[PDB]
Design an enzyme around this catalytic site. Structure first.
Site, short mmCIF file in Angstrom:
data_model
loop_
_atom_site.label_atom_id
_atom_site.label_comp_id
_atom_site.label_asym_id
_atom_site.label_seq_id
_atom_site.Cartn_x
_atom_site.Cartn_y
_atom_site.Cartn_z
N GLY A 222 0.71 -1.17 0.14
CA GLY A 222 -0.10 0.14 0.14
C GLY A 222 0.84 1.31 0.03
CG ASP A 223 0.72 5.88 -0.41
OD1 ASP A 223 1.56 6.21 0.06
OD2 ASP A 223 -0.06 6.91 -1.16
CG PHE A 224 4.70 5.06 4.14
CD1 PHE A 224 4.86 6.32 3.35
CD2 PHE A 224 5.80 4.26 3.91
CE1 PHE A 224 5.95 6.66 2.72
CE2 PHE A 224 6.99 4.79 3.27
CZ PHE A 224 7.16 5.87 2.69
CG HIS A 242 17.14 8.93 5.25
ND1 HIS A 242 18.39 8.92 5.03
CD2 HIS A 242 16.21 7.91 4.96
CE1 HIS A 242 18.57 7.68 4.35
NE2 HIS A 242 17.37 7.16 4.38
N1 LIG Z 1 4.29 5.40 -0.42
C1 LIG Z 1 5.03 4.50 0.13
N2 LIG Z 1 4.40 3.42 0.78
C2 LIG Z 1 5.11 2.60 1.38
N3 LIG Z 1 6.23 2.16 1.05
C3 LIG Z 1 7.02 3.21 0.43
C4 LIG Z 1 6.46 4.21 -0.32
N4 LIG Z 1 7.27 5.11 -0.92
C5 LIG Z 1 8.40 4.56 -0.80
N5 LIG Z 1 8.37 3.16 0.13
C6 LIG Z 1 9.40 2.35 0.27
O1 LIG Z 1 10.16 3.00 1.30
C7 LIG Z 1 11.47 2.12 1.43
C8 LIG Z 1 12.55 3.11 1.70
S1 LIG Z 1 14.22 2.20 1.72
C9 LIG Z 1 14.28 1.56 3.17
C10 LIG Z 1 14.36 -0.09 3.23
C11 LIG Z 1 14.46 -0.79 4.44
N6 LIG Z 1 13.61 -0.25 5.58
C12 LIG Z 1 15.95 -0.65 4.72
O2 LIG Z 1 16.33 0.07 5.57
O3 LIG Z 1 16.72 -1.51 3.91
C13 LIG Z 1 11.69 1.46 -0.31
O4 LIG Z 1 11.68 0.01 0.18
C14 LIG Z 1 10.30 1.96 -0.85
O5 LIG Z 1 9.86 1.06 -1.63
C1 LIG Z 2 27.82 8.54 2.34
C2 LIG Z 2 26.38 8.44 1.69
C3 LIG Z 2 25.58 7.22 1.87
C4 LIG Z 2 24.17 7.45 1.26
C5 LIG Z 2 23.36 6.15 1.37
C6 LIG Z 2 21.69 6.33 0.82
O1 LIG Z 2 21.62 7.36 0.15
N1 LIG Z 2 20.72 5.58 1.18
C7 LIG Z 2 19.80 5.54 0.90
C8 LIG Z 2 19.15 5.76 -0.27
S1 LIG Z 2 19.72 6.24 -2.11
S2 LIG Z 2 17.81 6.09 -3.09
C9 LIG Z 2 17.13 5.71 -1.41
C10 LIG Z 2 17.95 5.71 -0.45
N2 LIG Z 2 17.70 5.24 0.69
C11 LIG Z 2 16.40 5.01 1.30
C12 LIG Z 2 18.68 5.30 1.48
O2 LIG Z 2 18.59 4.87 2.82
#
Ligand SMILES: Nc1ncnc2c1ncn2[C@@H]1O[C@H](CSCC[C@H](N)C(=O)O)[C@@H](O)[C@H]1O
Ligand SMILES: CCCCCC(=O)Nc1c2sscc-2n(C)c1=O
Ligand SMILES: Nc1ncnc2c1ncn2[C@@H]1O[C@H](CSCC[C@H](N)C(=O)O)[C@@H](O)[C@H]1O
Ligand SMILES: CCCCCC(=O)Nc1c2sscc-2n(C)c1=O
Lengths: 340, 340
Positions: A222-224, A242
């Site tokens: 879904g969509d958070f 972030h």
């Molecule tokens: N509207 C939305 N609803 C749900 N998930 C979403 C979203 N927009 C982005 N995301 C998800 O947000 C994630 C952020 S990346 C973080 C992934 C994981 N928590 C980790 O730390 O490795 C992605 O996998 C992306 O698919």
């Molecule tokens: C020294 C820099 C390191 C950067 C690590 C970085 O950018 N991580 C990253 C990225 S890139 S596109 C989406 C993501 N998300 C969700 C992340 O957490």
């Protein structure tokens, strides 16, 4: 000293190009566990012996390879991590962060600092997550890239946070399930849900089955911004907040607050910046992360005060920030509903 | 550890973009000796306060600035070196090595490794030194860039080599006279000549006059492929031979041999690579230098054995290789005419 540190910073882009070439040419997999001759490697990647030799010498100079004898190369522990088949592989992470998709936007860093909005959209013609939803092979790489990044957190979180009091945990934007898998592996009676986009949820569903956790880990999509599935004792949100500007974050935390109801707790797993910037022992520089979030997504890293306010606004209070080992560079921010 | 070192290498290009932005926006000169408020700095460079703040926080994270209080920034010793007016300034060096001219060719590194010829020519439409001869402002930047790089060698050479036995020294490709100036400043009765291209000779002539060495340092222009001016006791060639392929180097060493005649000595001031590549404490990584020479000029860094052969061929013998302090990353190779 002062001059050597400046020189190191200035030549970073050339160092990255050397690593990018190692990753693209799959040299780590070519060398593997043995000592490989430059002439044998040269017929594996369509480079001449001399050219490949100079690249391997730079990789040895940068601690990725060893030249045991002239023209004979083994991987270091660092080089081993670029093997596709390494159990701690960050191969996909390396390819993702050296792809044009993640680097071209940095060529316009100043514009991003001027406009406060991502330069990705200008270069590639849509917001990053929309673009990836339309590019399945980049989406695939991204899922594996975030797995590689998250290993440091996945390997440490359950030793720095007590998960034993919870019956159910839901990972909000939990990617391919790397984080929740690591937690469930340590708590056999714990039940999990991964909440993701339909596209990434497909990856998570396959991962959970492959990992043998199908019986106690579910995947929902879904969509958070719309909602977070309710009824869990604990919610995780890692490396997600972030990605978004302050208003989008409040909207995500708003969906989380509804899901928490009375007895729900939220764990925000992310950089907590200090009020005053200074050098950081984290494996990934949190201020470079901040500017990556700006150029790619229009996101940012935040101080405890900046997040505490965004919580307050979502109807949430930052309860408590817990540290992880310094090399990880993420903190565990416990969030509960605001007394109001 | 292994993973942190790999992460450091991968994110080098983003670190370089942060430093490039500091240099382009002249933030070091804006901050100068004091503590500067981000809001005051924001009106100096046409960035908003928030954007400039995030850039300065990354620069603090990378050891270039200090955030003493939130929004208040001072330079570190490293940041001070990016001031145009610092006595040890490498500002021009920083601008040169982050210009499109020196970085765009790295985008085609693999092609350079495949072809063995520079990618500069493909991007900018002529060989680098021809291109600069037609671009006076880049030529100006280059002269100042090489001065900045050479400071480490200029400050150490006369303490690691005895210049007292010589009446005359000629610096072959001596740039703006940074190296010979440092030597003459320590030997009041020593006489110098700088041998350069007409374009750079103009810079050297002005430098020698400005430095008050006009009375005992001359400038002469020409082509070290045509000849090196004769009659000197000692010839220097610094950061020059690494610019050229092996055959062009022999042609330069051939001009040098003629100039040495009977009682002439040649000092080749350059990287001497080990037979087996490994990490190096030099302020500038010699294998990154090797690949820079490839992509920009089709040059390379060389081992003592590779140079000893190129000398042998020019009718010269490598007599003796003397070290400089490890941070400098250049050696002094004494060359005398081959007994034959
Ligand atoms: N509207 C939305 N609803 C749900 N998930 C979403 C979203 N927009 C982005 N995301 C998800 O947000 C994630 C952020 S990346 C973080 C992934 C994981 N928590 C980790 O730390 O490795 C992605 O996998 C992306 O698919
Ligand atoms: C020294 C820099 C390191 C950067 C690590 C970085 O950018 N991580 C990253 C990225 S890139 S596109 C989406 C993501 N998300 C969700 C992340 O957490
Ligand atoms: N054909 C030629 N004849 C003479 N000088 C040349 C030349 N081609 C290039 N050069 C000079 O070679 C120099 C190489 S850069 C090295 C400059 C100085 N020795 C230092 O270390 O700082 C440049 O200044 C360039 O102008
Ligand atoms: C970590 C890499 C450091 C690279 C330093 C470098 O490239 N120096 C350089 C250049 S660039 S164009 C001409 C030149 N000459 C003559 C040089 O000596």
């Amino acid at each position: 000293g002062a001059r050597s540190l400046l020189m190191q910073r200035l030549f970073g882009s050339r160092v990255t190009e050397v690593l990018a070439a190692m990753a693209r040419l799959d040299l780590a997999d070519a060398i593997g566990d043995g000592i490989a001759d430059v002439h044998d490697l040269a017929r594996s990647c369509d480079l001449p012996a001399d050219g490949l030799h100079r690249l391997l010498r730079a990789l040895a100079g940068l601690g990725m390879c060893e030249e045991s004898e002239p023209g004979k190369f083994a991987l270091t522990a660092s080089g081993a991590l670029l093997r596709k088949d390494h159990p701690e592989s960050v191969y996909d992470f390396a390819r993702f962060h050296t792809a044009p998709e993640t680097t071209r936007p940095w060529t316009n860093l100043e514009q991003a600092l001027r406009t406060g909005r991502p330069t990705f959209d200008e270069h590639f013609g849509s917001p990053l997550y929309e673009y990836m939803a339309g590019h399945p092979e980049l989406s695939a790489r991204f899922a594996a890239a975030m797995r590689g990044e998250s290993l440091a957190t996945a390997d440490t979180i359950a030793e720095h946070y007590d998960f034993s009091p919870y019956r159910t945990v839901t990972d909000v934007g939990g990617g391919d399930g790397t984080l929740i898998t690591a937690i469930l592996r340590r708590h056999p009676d714990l039940r999990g849900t991964i909440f993701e986009t339909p596209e990434i949820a497909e990856r998570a569903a396959e991962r959970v089955r492959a990992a043998g956790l199908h019986d106690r880990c579910a995947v929902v999509s879904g969509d958070f911004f719309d909602l977070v599935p309710g009824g869990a004792d604990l919610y995780l949100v890692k490396s997600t907040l972030h990605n978004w500007d302050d208003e989008h974050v409040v909207r995500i935390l708003s969906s989380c607050r509804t899901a928490l109801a009375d007895r729900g707790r939220l764990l925000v797993i992310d950089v907590v910046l200090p009020d005053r910037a200074e050098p950081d022992p984290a494996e990934l520089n949190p201020y470079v992360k901040d500017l990556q979030m700006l150029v790619l997504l229009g996101g940012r890293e935040r101080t405890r005060a900046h997040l505490d306010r965004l919580c307050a606004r979502a109807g949430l209070v930052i309860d408590r920030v817990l540290p992880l080992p310094p090399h990880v560079g993420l903190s565990l921010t416990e969030v509960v509903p605001a007394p109001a």
